[PDB]
Coordinates of C-alpha atoms in Angstrom, one line a residue:
Chain A
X1 CA 0.0 -0.1 0.2
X2 CA 1.1 3.4 -0.8
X3 CA 2.0 5.9 2.0
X4 CA -1.2 8.5 0.7
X5 CA -3.4 5.2 0.0
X6 CA -2.0 4.9 4.2
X7 CA -3.3 8.9 4.3
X8 CA -6.7 8.3 2.4
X9 CA -7.7 5.7 4.1
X10 CA -6.9 6.7 8.1
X11 CA -9.4 9.9 6.2
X12 CA -11.7 7.6 5.7
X13 CA -11.8 5.7 8.8
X14 CA -11.7 9.2 10.6
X15 CA -15.2 9.4 8.9
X16 CA -16.6 6.6 10.4
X17 CA -15.1 6.8 13.8
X18 CA -12.6 3.7 13.4
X19 CA -9.2 5.1 13.2
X20 CA -6.4 3.9 14.8
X21 CA -4.0 6.1 16.7
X22 CA -1.8 7.8 14.6
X23 CA 0.6 10.8 14.2
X24 CA -1.0 13.6 12.6
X25 CA -1.6 14.9 9.0
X26 CA -0.2 18.2 8.6
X27 CA -2.5 19.7 5.7
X28 CA -1.3 23.8 5.7
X29 CA -3.3 26.0 3.7
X30 CA -1.3 27.2 0.4
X31 CA -2.7 28.6 -2.1
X32 CA -2.0 32.4 -3.7
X33 CA 1.8 31.1 -2.2
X34 CA 1.9 28.3 -4.8
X35 CA 1.1 30.9 -7.8
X36 CA 4.7 31.5 -7.3
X37 CA 5.5 28.6 -8.9
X38 CA 5.0 29.6 -12.8
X39 CA 4.5 33.2 -11.0
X40 CA 2.1 34.2 -12.5
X41 CA -0.6 36.3 -10.7
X42 CA -3.4 34.1 -7.5
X43 CA -5.9 35.7 -8.8
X44 CA -5.5 34.1 -12.5
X45 CA -4.3 30.1 -11.1
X46 CA -8.0 29.9 -8.7
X47 CA -10.1 30.6 -12.4
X48 CA -8.2 28.1 -14.5
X49 CA -8.4 24.0 -13.4
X50 CA -5.5 22.8 -15.1
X51 CA -2.8 25.5 -14.2
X52 CA -4.3 25.1 -10.8
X53 CA -3.3 20.9 -10.1
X54 CA 0.2 22.2 -11.7
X55 CA 1.2 24.8 -9.2
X56 CA -0.2 22.9 -6.1
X57 CA 1.1 19.4 -6.6
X58 CA 4.2 20.6 -7.7
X59 CA 4.1 22.8 -4.5
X60 CA 4.0 19.6 -2.8
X61 CA 6.2 17.6 -4.3
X62 CA 8.9 20.2 -3.3
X63 CA 7.8 20.5 -0.1
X64 CA 7.0 16.7 0.4
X65 CA 3.5 16.8 1.9
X66 CA 1.1 14.0 2.2
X67 CA -1.8 16.3 1.0
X68 CA -2.6 19.6 -0.4
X69 CA -5.1 22.3 -0.3
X70 CA -7.7 22.7 -3.5
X71 CA -8.9 25.4 -1.8
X72 CA -8.7 27.9 1.0
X73 CA -11.9 30.2 2.3
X74 CA -11.5 33.0 0.2
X75 CA -15.1 33.7 -0.5
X76 CA -16.3 31.6 -3.1
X77 CA -19.5 30.5 -1.1
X78 CA -20.5 34.1 -1.2
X79 CA -19.2 35.0 -4.5
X80 CA -21.4 31.5 -6.1
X81 CA -24.5 32.5 -4.7
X82 CA -24.0 36.5 -5.4
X83 CA -22.1 38.3 -3.2
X84 CA -20.1 41.3 -5.0
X85 CA -16.2 40.2 -4.9
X86 CA -13.1 41.7 -5.8
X87 CA -11.8 40.1 -8.9
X88 CA -8.5 42.2 -9.1
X89 CA -6.5 41.0 -6.0
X90 CA -5.9 37.9 -3.9
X91 CA -7.7 37.4 -1.5
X92 CA -10.6 38.7 -2.8
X93 CA -12.7 41.2 -0.6
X94 CA -16.2 41.3 0.6
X95 CA -18.2 43.8 -1.5
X96 CA -20.9 46.3 -0.3
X97 CA -23.8 44.5 -2.4
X98 CA -25.3 41.3 -3.4
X99 CA -28.7 39.6 -5.2
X100 CA -28.8 36.3 -3.3
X101 CA -32.5 34.4 -2.5
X102 CA -31.4 32.8 1.0
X103 CA -34.5 31.1 1.1
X104 CA -34.6 29.8 -2.8
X105 CA -33.5 25.9 -3.1
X106 CA -29.6 25.5 -4.0
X107 CA -29.0 25.3 -7.7
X108 CA -26.0 22.6 -7.9
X109 CA -25.2 23.7 -11.2
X110 CA -25.5 26.5 -10.8
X111 CA -22.7 26.3 -7.7
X112 CA -20.1 24.0 -9.5
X113 CA -20.5 26.0 -12.2
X114 CA -19.5 29.6 -10.5
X115 CA -15.6 30.2 -12.1
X116 CA -13.1 30.0 -8.9
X117 CA -15.4 27.0 -7.6
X118 CA -15.4 24.9 -11.4
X119 CA -11.6 25.4 -11.8
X120 CA -11.1 23.9 -8.0
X121 CA -13.4 21.3 -9.3
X122 CA -11.4 19.9 -12.0
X123 CA -8.6 20.4 -10.3
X124 CA -9.2 17.6 -7.7
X125 CA -10.5 15.7 -10.7
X126 CA -7.1 16.3 -12.0
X127 CA -5.2 15.7 -9.1
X128 CA -7.7 12.7 -8.3
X129 CA -5.2 10.2 -10.8
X130 CA -2.0 11.1 -8.7
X131 CA 0.0 8.2 -8.9
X132 CA 1.1 9.6 -5.1
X133 CA -2.6 9.3 -3.9
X134 CA -2.3 12.7 -2.0
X135 CA -4.8 13.5 0.6
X136 CA -6.8 16.3 -1.5
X137 CA -7.8 18.9 1.1
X138 CA -10.8 21.6 0.3
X139 CA -10.9 24.2 3.1
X140 CA -13.6 26.0 2.8
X141 CA -15.9 29.1 4.9
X142 CA -17.7 28.1 7.8
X143 CA -21.1 28.9 8.3
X144 CA -21.1 31.1 10.4
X145 CA -17.9 33.1 8.4
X146 CA -19.9 32.9 5.4
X147 CA -23.6 34.0 7.3
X148 CA -21.4 37.3 8.3
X149 CA -20.1 37.3 4.9
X150 CA -24.0 38.3 3.5
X151 CA -25.2 40.5 6.0
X152 CA -22.1 42.7 4.9
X153 CA -22.5 42.7 1.7
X154 CA -26.7 43.4 2.7
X155 CA -28.8 41.0 2.9
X156 CA -31.4 41.2 4.7
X157 CA -32.3 37.4 7.0
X158 CA -33.2 35.9 9.8
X159 CA -31.0 33.8 11.5
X160 CA -33.3 30.6 10.8
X161 CA -33.3 30.8 7.1
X162 CA -30.2 32.7 7.1
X163 CA -27.9 29.4 8.8
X164 CA -29.9 27.4 7.0
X165 CA -29.6 28.9 3.7
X166 CA -25.7 28.2 4.9
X167 CA -25.8 25.1 5.5
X168 CA -27.1 24.6 2.5
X169 CA -25.0 25.8 0.2
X170 CA -22.0 24.4 2.5
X171 CA -23.8 20.6 2.1
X172 CA -24.2 21.1 -1.5
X173 CA -20.5 22.0 -1.6
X174 CA -19.3 19.1 0.4
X175 CA -20.9 16.4 -1.9
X176 CA -20.1 17.8 -4.8
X177 CA -16.6 17.6 -3.7
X178 CA -16.4 14.7 -3.1
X179 CA -17.8 13.3 -5.3
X180 CA -15.2 15.1 -7.8
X181 CA -12.1 13.4 -5.2
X182 CA -12.1 15.8 -2.2
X183 CA -10.5 13.4 0.8
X184 CA -11.1 16.3 3.2
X185 CA -13.6 19.1 4.5
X186 CA -12.9 22.3 6.6
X187 CA -15.0 25.1 8.1
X188 CA -13.0 27.6 9.1
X189 CA -14.3 29.7 11.2
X190 CA -12.7 33.3 13.2
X191 CA -14.9 33.1 16.7
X192 CA -18.2 31.4 18.2
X193 CA -21.3 32.9 17.1
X194 CA -23.3 34.5 19.7
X195 CA -25.3 32.3 21.9
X196 CA -29.0 33.1 19.8
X197 CA -26.7 32.0 16.8
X198 CA -25.2 29.4 18.2
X199 CA -27.6 27.1 17.9
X200 CA -28.7 27.4 13.8
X201 CA -24.5 27.3 13.7
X202 CA -24.6 24.5 14.9
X203 CA -26.7 22.5 12.4
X204 CA -26.0 23.6 9.9
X205 CA -22.2 22.4 10.9
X206 CA -24.5 19.2 11.6
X207 CA -26.0 19.3 8.0
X208 CA -23.3 19.8 6.1
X209 CA -20.7 17.2 7.9
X210 CA -23.3 14.7 7.5
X211 CA -23.1 14.8 4.2
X212 CA -19.3 14.5 4.0
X213 CA -19.5 11.4 5.9
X214 CA -21.4 9.8 3.8
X215 CA -18.9 10.5 1.5
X216 CA -16.0 8.6 3.3
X217 CA -14.7 12.6 4.0
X218 CA -14.1 14.0 7.8
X219 CA -15.5 17.1 8.7
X220 CA -13.4 19.6 10.6
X221 CA -14.5 22.4 12.3
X222 CA -11.6 24.9 12.1
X223 CA -11.1 28.0 14.9
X224 CA -8.6 30.3 15.0
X225 CA -5.2 28.8 16.8
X226 CA -4.4 32.1 19.1
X227 CA -17.3 23.2 25.9
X228 CA -17.1 21.5 22.8
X229 CA -19.4 22.5 19.4
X230 CA -20.6 18.7 18.0
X231 CA -21.2 15.3 20.1
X232 CA -23.5 13.0 18.4
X233 CA -20.3 10.8 17.4
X234 CA -17.2 12.3 17.6
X235 CA -16.1 14.9 15.8
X236 CA -12.9 16.8 14.8
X237 CA -12.9 20.8 17.1
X238 CA -10.2 23.5 17.8
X239 CA -9.2 25.3 20.4
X240 CA -9.3 25.2 23.8
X241 CA -9.9 15.3 28.7
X242 CA -11.9 15.4 25.1
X243 CA -11.6 13.2 22.0
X244 CA -11.2 16.1 19.4
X245 CA -9.1 14.8 16.3
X246 CA -8.4 18.2 14.9
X247 CA -5.8 21.0 16.1
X248 CA -5.7 24.3 14.6
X249 CA -2.5 25.8 13.9
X250 CA -1.4 29.7 12.9
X251 CA -0.7 30.4 9.4
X252 CA 3.1 32.1 9.6
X253 CA 5.5 29.0 9.3
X254 CA 7.9 31.0 11.1
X255 CA 5.6 30.7 14.2
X256 CA 4.9 26.8 13.7
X257 CA 6.2 24.0 16.3
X258 CA 7.4 20.6 15.7
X259 CA 5.1 18.2 14.7
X260 CA 4.2 16.2 17.4
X261 CA 4.0 12.0 17.9
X262 CA 2.2 9.7 17.6
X263 CA 0.4 9.7 21.7
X264 CA -1.1 13.1 21.3
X265 CA -4.6 13.5 20.9
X266 CA -5.2 14.5 17.1
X267 CA -5.2 12.9 14.5
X268 CA -4.2 15.9 12.1
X269 CA -3.5 18.8 12.1
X270 CA -4.4 22.3 9.9
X271 CA -3.6 25.8 10.1
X272 CA -6.2 28.6 10.7
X273 CA -5.8 30.2 7.9
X274 CA -3.8 30.7 4.2
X275 CA 0.1 30.6 4.6
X276 CA 0.4 34.2 3.9
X277 CA 1.2 34.3 -0.4
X278 CA 4.1 36.8 0.0
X279 CA 6.1 34.6 1.6
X280 CA 9.0 33.2 -0.7
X281 CA 8.6 29.4 -2.1
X282 CA 12.0 29.2 -0.4
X283 CA 11.4 30.0 3.1
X284 CA 8.2 27.7 3.4
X285 CA 10.2 24.9 2.5
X286 CA 13.1 26.0 4.9
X287 CA 9.9 25.8 7.7
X288 CA 8.5 22.9 6.6
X289 CA 11.4 20.9 6.5
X290 CA 12.3 22.1 10.5
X291 CA 9.2 20.9 11.5
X292 CA 9.7 17.9 10.4
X293 CA 12.8 17.6 11.5
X294 CA 14.5 17.5 8.6
Chain B
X1 CA -1.2 -1.9 28.4
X2 CA 2.2 -1.5 28.5
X3 CA 3.5 1.4 26.4
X4 CA 7.5 0.4 27.1
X5 CA 6.8 -3.4 26.4
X6 CA 6.4 -2.2 22.5
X7 CA 9.6 0.1 22.5
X8 CA 11.3 -2.5 24.6
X9 CA 10.2 -5.6 21.6
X10 CA 11.1 -3.2 18.7
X11 CA 14.9 -3.1 20.6
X12 CA 15.0 -6.6 20.5
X13 CA 14.1 -6.7 17.0
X14 CA 16.7 -4.4 16.3
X15 CA 19.3 -7.0 17.2
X16 CA 18.1 -9.6 14.7
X17 CA 17.9 -7.1 12.1
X18 CA 13.9 -7.9 11.7
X19 CA 12.4 -4.3 12.6
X20 CA 9.9 -2.9 11.1
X21 CA 10.6 0.7 10.2
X22 CA 8.2 2.7 13.2
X23 CA 8.8 6.0 15.0
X24 CA 13.1 6.6 16.2
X25 CA 13.7 6.1 20.4
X26 CA 14.9 9.1 22.2
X27 CA 17.1 7.7 23.4
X28 CA 19.6 11.3 24.7
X29 CA 22.1 10.2 27.3
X30 CA 21.7 12.1 30.6
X31 CA 23.6 11.5 33.6
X32 CA 25.0 14.3 35.5
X33 CA 22.0 16.7 34.9
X34 CA 19.8 14.3 36.7
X35 CA 21.4 14.8 40.5
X36 CA 19.5 18.1 40.4
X37 CA 16.6 16.0 40.9
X38 CA 17.9 15.7 44.4
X39 CA 20.3 18.4 44.3
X40 CA 23.1 16.3 45.3
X41 CA 26.8 15.8 44.0
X42 CA 27.0 14.0 40.5
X43 CA 29.8 11.8 41.8
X44 CA 28.1 10.8 44.9
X45 CA 24.9 10.1 42.8
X46 CA 26.5 7.3 40.2
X47 CA 27.7 5.6 43.8
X48 CA 24.9 4.0 44.9
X49 CA 22.5 1.7 43.1
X50 CA 19.0 3.6 43.9
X51 CA 20.5 7.3 44.4
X52 CA 20.9 6.5 40.7
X53 CA 17.8 4.9 40.1
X54 CA 15.1 7.1 41.2
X55 CA 17.3 10.3 39.9
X56 CA 17.0 8.8 37.0
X57 CA 13.5 7.4 36.9
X58 CA 11.7 10.6 38.0
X59 CA 13.8 12.5 35.0
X60 CA 12.7 10.3 32.9
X61 CA 9.0 10.4 33.6
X62 CA 9.4 14.3 33.8
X63 CA 10.2 14.4 30.4
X64 CA 8.1 11.7 29.5
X65 CA 10.7 10.3 27.8
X66 CA 10.5 6.0 26.9
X67 CA 14.3 5.2 27.5
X68 CA 17.0 6.0 30.4
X69 CA 20.5 6.1 30.4
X70 CA 21.6 4.2 33.3
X71 CA 25.6 4.7 32.3
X72 CA 27.1 7.3 30.2
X73 CA 30.9 7.1 28.4
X74 CA 32.6 8.5 32.0
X75 CA 36.0 6.4 32.5
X76 CA 34.3 3.4 33.8
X77 CA 35.9 1.3 31.8
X78 CA 39.6 2.5 32.7
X79 CA 38.9 2.4 36.2
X80 CA 37.5 -1.2 36.6
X81 CA 40.8 -2.1 35.1
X82 CA 43.5 -0.4 36.9
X83 CA 43.4 3.2 36.1
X84 CA 43.7 6.4 37.2
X85 CA 41.0 8.0 37.6
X86 CA 39.9 11.7 39.2
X87 CA 37.1 10.8 41.5
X88 CA 36.6 14.8 43.0
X89 CA 34.7 15.7 40.3
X90 CA 31.8 15.6 37.5
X91 CA 33.0 14.2 34.5
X92 CA 35.7 12.4 35.7
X93 CA 39.2 12.5 33.9
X94 CA 41.9 10.3 32.9
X95 CA 45.1 10.3 34.9
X96 CA 48.7 9.3 34.2
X97 CA 49.0 6.0 36.1
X98 CA 47.8 2.7 35.8
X99 CA 48.2 -0.7 36.9
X100 CA 46.2 -2.7 34.1
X101 CA 47.3 -6.8 33.2
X102 CA 46.8 -5.9 29.2
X103 CA 47.2 -10.4 29.2
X104 CA 45.1 -11.5 32.2
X105 CA 41.8 -12.8 31.9
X106 CA 38.7 -11.0 32.5
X107 CA 37.8 -10.6 35.7
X108 CA 33.9 -10.4 36.0
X109 CA 33.4 -10.2 39.4
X110 CA 36.3 -8.4 40.0
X111 CA 34.3 -6.1 37.3
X112 CA 31.7 -6.3 38.5
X113 CA 32.8 -5.3 41.7
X114 CA 33.7 -1.8 40.9
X115 CA 32.0 0.6 42.3
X116 CA 30.7 2.7 39.7
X117 CA 29.8 0.2 37.8
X118 CA 28.3 -2.0 40.8
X119 CA 26.0 1.1 40.5
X120 CA 25.1 1.6 37.4
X121 CA 24.5 -2.5 37.8
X122 CA 22.4 -1.3 40.8
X123 CA 19.9 1.0 39.7
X124 CA 19.4 -1.3 35.9
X125 CA 17.9 -4.3 38.2
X126 CA 15.9 -1.6 40.3
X127 CA 14.3 -0.1 37.3
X128 CA 14.0 -3.5 35.9
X129 CA 10.7 -3.7 38.3
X130 CA 10.0 -0.5 36.6
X131 CA 5.5 -1.0 35.4
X132 CA 6.5 1.5 32.7
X133 CA 8.8 -1.2 31.6
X134 CA 11.5 1.7 29.9
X135 CA 14.6 1.2 27.4
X136 CA 17.3 0.8 29.8
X137 CA 20.3 2.0 27.5
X138 CA 23.9 1.2 28.7
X139 CA 26.4 3.9 26.9
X140 CA 29.9 2.5 27.0
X141 CA 33.6 3.9 26.2
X142 CA 34.3 2.6 22.9
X143 CA 37.4 0.1 22.4
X144 CA 39.4 3.0 20.3
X145 CA 38.2 5.0 23.0
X146 CA 39.3 3.1 26.2
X147 CA 42.2 1.5 23.4
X148 CA 43.7 5.4 23.4
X149 CA 42.9 6.2 27.7
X150 CA 45.1 3.1 28.3
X151 CA 48.1 4.4 26.2
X152 CA 47.2 7.6 27.6
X153 CA 47.6 6.6 31.3
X154 CA 51.0 4.8 30.4
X155 CA 50.0 1.8 29.4
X156 CA 52.7 0.4 26.7
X157 CA 50.8 -2.6 24.8
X158 CA 50.9 -4.0 20.8
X159 CA 47.7 -2.9 18.7
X160 CA 46.6 -6.9 18.6
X161 CA 46.9 -7.9 22.8
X162 CA 45.3 -3.6 23.6
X163 CA 42.3 -4.4 20.8
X164 CA 41.7 -7.6 22.1
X165 CA 41.9 -6.4 26.3
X166 CA 39.3 -3.7 25.2
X167 CA 36.7 -5.6 23.3
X168 CA 36.7 -8.0 26.2
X169 CA 36.2 -6.0 29.0
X170 CA 33.1 -4.3 26.6
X171 CA 32.6 -8.3 25.9
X172 CA 32.1 -9.1 29.9
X173 CA 30.1 -5.6 30.1
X174 CA 27.7 -5.7 27.7
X175 CA 26.6 -9.5 29.0
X176 CA 26.3 -8.2 32.5
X177 CA 24.2 -4.9 32.1
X178 CA 22.3 -7.5 29.5
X179 CA 21.7 -10.1 32.4
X180 CA 20.9 -6.7 35.1
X181 CA 18.3 -5.6 32.9
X182 CA 20.2 -3.5 29.7
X183 CA 18.0 -3.0 26.8
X184 CA 19.9 -1.3 24.6
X185 CA 23.5 -0.9 24.2
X186 CA 25.5 1.6 22.3
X187 CA 29.8 2.5 22.0
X188 CA 30.4 5.5 22.3
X189 CA 33.8 6.8 20.5
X190 CA 35.8 10.4 18.8
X191 CA 36.9 8.9 15.7
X192 CA 37.1 5.9 14.1
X193 CA 41.0 5.0 14.1
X194 CA 43.2 4.5 12.0
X195 CA 44.1 2.3 9.0
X196 CA 46.4 0.5 10.6
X197 CA 44.0 -0.3 13.7
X198 CA 41.0 -0.7 12.1
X199 CA 40.5 -4.4 11.7
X200 CA 41.3 -5.2 15.3
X201 CA 38.8 -2.2 16.0
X202 CA 36.5 -4.3 14.0
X203 CA 37.4 -7.7 15.2
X204 CA 36.4 -5.7 18.9
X205 CA 33.6 -4.5 17.8
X206 CA 32.5 -7.8 17.0
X207 CA 33.6 -9.5 20.4
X208 CA 31.4 -7.5 21.9
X209 CA 28.3 -6.7 19.9
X210 CA 27.6 -10.6 19.7
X211 CA 27.5 -11.4 22.7
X212 CA 24.9 -8.3 23.2
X213 CA 22.6 -9.7 19.8
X214 CA 23.1 -13.4 21.7
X215 CA 21.0 -11.5 24.8
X216 CA 18.7 -10.3 22.4
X217 CA 19.6 -6.7 23.0
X218 CA 21.1 -4.2 20.2
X219 CA 24.9 -3.2 20.3
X220 CA 24.7 1.0 18.9
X221 CA 28.5 2.5 17.6
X222 CA 28.0 6.2 18.4
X223 CA 30.4 8.6 16.8
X224 CA 30.3 12.4 17.5
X225 CA 27.1 14.4 15.0
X226 CA 29.7 16.8 13.7
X227 CA 31.8 13.9 12.1
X228 CA 31.8 13.9 8.6
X229 CA 30.5 10.8 6.9
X230 CA 31.6 7.9 6.4
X231 CA 31.7 4.1 6.0
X232 CA 30.3 2.4 9.1
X233 CA 31.2 -1.2 10.4
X234 CA 29.5 -5.0 9.8
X235 CA 30.4 -5.4 13.7
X236 CA 27.7 -2.8 14.9
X237 CA 24.0 -0.8 14.4
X238 CA 25.1 2.2 12.8
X239 CA 24.3 5.6 14.2
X240 CA 24.9 8.6 11.5
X241 CA 23.6 12.1 11.7
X242 CA 21.2 13.9 10.7
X243 CA 23.4 15.7 8.0
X244 CA 24.2 12.2 6.6
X245 CA 23.4 9.8 3.4
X246 CA 20.8 7.2 3.5
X247 CA 22.3 3.7 4.2
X248 CA 21.9 0.7 2.5
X249 CA 18.3 -0.4 2.6
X250 CA 19.6 -3.8 4.3
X251 CA 20.9 -2.3 7.0
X252 CA 18.1 -0.9 9.7
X253 CA 20.2 1.9 11.8
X254 CA 19.3 4.5 14.0
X255 CA 20.3 8.4 14.0
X256 CA 23.0 10.9 16.2
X257 CA 22.2 14.1 17.7
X258 CA 24.9 16.2 19.0
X259 CA 24.7 16.9 23.2
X260 CA 23.5 20.1 23.6
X261 CA 19.5 20.5 24.2
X262 CA 19.2 23.7 22.1
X263 CA 20.4 22.6 18.8
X264 CA 18.4 19.4 18.5
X265 CA 16.1 19.5 15.7
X266 CA 12.9 18.0 16.1
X267 CA 11.8 14.3 16.1
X268 CA 11.3 12.8 12.4
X269 CA 8.2 12.2 11.0
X270 CA 7.1 8.1 10.2
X271 CA 9.1 7.3 7.6
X272 CA 11.8 7.4 8.8
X273 CA 15.1 4.7 8.8
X274 CA 15.6 5.1 12.0
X275 CA 14.4 3.0 14.2
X276 CA 16.1 4.6 17.5
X277 CA 18.4 8.1 18.4
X278 CA 21.1 8.5 20.6
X279 CA 23.5 11.7 21.3
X280 CA 26.9 11.3 20.5
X281 CA 27.7 12.7 24.3
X282 CA 25.8 13.6 28.1
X283 CA 23.8 16.2 28.1
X284 CA 25.9 18.8 29.3
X285 CA 25.6 18.5 33.5
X286 CA 25.5 22.1 34.1
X287 CA 22.2 22.5 31.8
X288 CA 19.0 23.2 33.7
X289 CA 16.4 20.4 34.4
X290 CA 14.1 23.1 33.5
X291 CA 15.2 23.8 30.3
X292 CA 15.5 20.3 29.1
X293 CA 12.3 19.6 29.4
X294 CA 11.5 22.7 27.7
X295 CA 13.9 21.5 25.1
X296 CA 12.9 18.0 25.2
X297 CA 8.9 19.3 25.0
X298 CA 9.5 21.4 22.3
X299 CA 11.6 18.1 20.1
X300 CA 8.0 16.4 20.8
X301 CA 6.5 19.3 19.4
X302 CA 4.8 19.9 23.2

């Protein structure tokens, strides 16, 4: 069995709670930084499927990592449903206008045809034939963060309906990513929402996470590194014993600690945000090599 | 169940070269530093078995390590055979006089009764009942280094006889340590000897290493981490440094680190070839217990 086939099996076992204890899988969020491989602008790379798979996979081979990030939280979810997002700079910014229907049923084909989402799905399908079998991870915007983005653009909606809408977008994205070939899914949040929204937020996480597991993909909630949220099976939670399966690191590679030994409680390590795109390709490699003991 | 039973089995598999790849066992050489647990002088600790066993075991549990070092290269072999060794400071120094008989057959009872060796054997027997089953390692002076120590004190003897003698001392010690409960043995050298002595040195390594393996204890040859990459004799488990090129897959081996904890790298990922990590010398005794704990925690990702 290949080394990456083992890591893919470890994620599928994790999705059904049948995991055996092992050293955690290091999945740093890298996107705009990878564009330095071909020296092309990041905002152009993420729009092309074939070019995306070349920069992301070749950077992974240079970094000797067992996983790559086909998608980072970058307003892709807001752009697809009708929110104004900046297209001239990376990372994209949320605008001030929106033409969104939170009550309408999600059109999966329209979702999958959004320029940056369509390119990410095409990249997954192409990486899914890599003989190294890397763990194809997709880091999405969390429901609470997505709810905030919608209201920032000017969407007026109640808490129950807007979190149901956000949960339906992520549940549809989970199926589309998993059917393309994604092995690991994560929801990135900036903070735990207000108590009045906490319940709707947990239900949106459960809805999307339940389809993820149905496709043998483990769903991870990632909160910034600097009681637990869910409790039905054994989900991977973040921040503050209990048997949580994820660990959050900061995005700055110089500040990463060593990779932990087998006995630690996590079986996965993610960065709370994408590795700074300005960071040089050589310095990122040097810090990844440091972290692995090379 | 028993965390240390798996590590002890991994060492026994290493002794017959049949190990399956796993994350390396971290065995730093720690001796005089551990004496700060009870705040007793290092030279006194190494002369009482129980005092040695509790200071080492409590530091071992404090650092969360799966192994401890009951013996460190510290002139114990030269002291036992008749070399003048300093008794007033740690680490001991080789003197300028010696009353040694290189030709005589080794007296195991006299060897095992040398104050610091008897206490190390006394500590091993007591650690052998620890329910955590740690890997009890014993780091000895290498044959070439022991040969040099004898000639530094004033022993006049030929290469063949003096390396045969050094090999008989280490072969007898290997049995005494293994029967006491040692799970890992290492021979620490400062450099590869001259070509003129290379064969005698390899034969002394084979003599001692062959009894070690017979007791299911792997014998590891440790050369300084700062030395450049070079040949590794078949008579012992190789222990290259982190910057040294990989060895052929038919040779299972260990990794050598420097003694300074601040300079240690991270512990490597699962896929690495080494089954074991040792320091080329004991961790500087002056280093504080609190700073050592922080460096071990850094190395493990805590």
